[PDB]
Amino acid sequence: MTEYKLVVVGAGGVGKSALTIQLIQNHFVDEYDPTIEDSYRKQVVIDGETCLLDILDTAGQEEYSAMRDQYMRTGEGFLCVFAINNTKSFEDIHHYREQIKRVKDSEDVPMVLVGNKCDLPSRTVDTKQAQDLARSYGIPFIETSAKTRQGVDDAFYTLVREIRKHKEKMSKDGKKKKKKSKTKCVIM
Structure with a gap:
């Protein structure tokens, strides 16, 4: 069993608590708060692999912690989490x-671009914007909806798989590799 540690950051007031609280509970609905802090x-279990998914649900009340x-x-x-x-x-x-990657x-660094409220016909972000972010980090991107309760399903499982892959690439890369240990000079 591998602990897949998750942390939800960015885009607040969008409905972060609704997505996380509901995904974990699926008992209470129509929940909406500015920001709820409760881990x-x-x-x-993914692909027959038991793992721990802890969603660090926090509020942006204080960045200094x-x-x-x-x-x-x-x-x-x-x-x-974002609203398209x-x-x-x-x-x-x-x-x-x-900041996180820095x-x-x-x-x-493992992460997946996952938005909410895709059902609402008021998209202000095109494919190329989400694509640009995801392609920059070399990871896939997707849109979801708390109302639908479907996209978060794919997003959550997809995130886990990408995280595992990061371990794959990192392992193959090993401690070091590069192209040349030695050094050369361009000179004139």
Whole structure:
């Protein structure tokens, strides 16, 4: 069993609590709050592989938290919650993605671009914007809806698979590899 550590960051007020609370519970509906801080730990079996999916549901009340930084370092994958009908939502995601990848290493950090409220006919972000973000990190992108309760299903399982793949590429890459150990000079 491998603990697949998840953390939800970026785009707040969009309905982060609804997606996470509902996905874990599926008992209460029509829940909507500005931002609810309450971590949830739910294990899920993927492709016959038992793993722990802990969705770190937190609020942006204070960016200065030792625990917040602590979780980001220990996290394995990030959920990119955004509203396709809002520029700010995906724009906010980009800022967080750049900081997270910067802090940890670079465009090699596990995460999947997953939005909500796709049913609403008011898209402000085209394929190329979501595509640009996903292609930048070399990972797939998708849109979902809490109302539909379907896209989050694919997004959650897909995220897990990409995380596993990161381990695959990283393992094959090993501690080091590059093209040449030696060095050369362009000179004139």
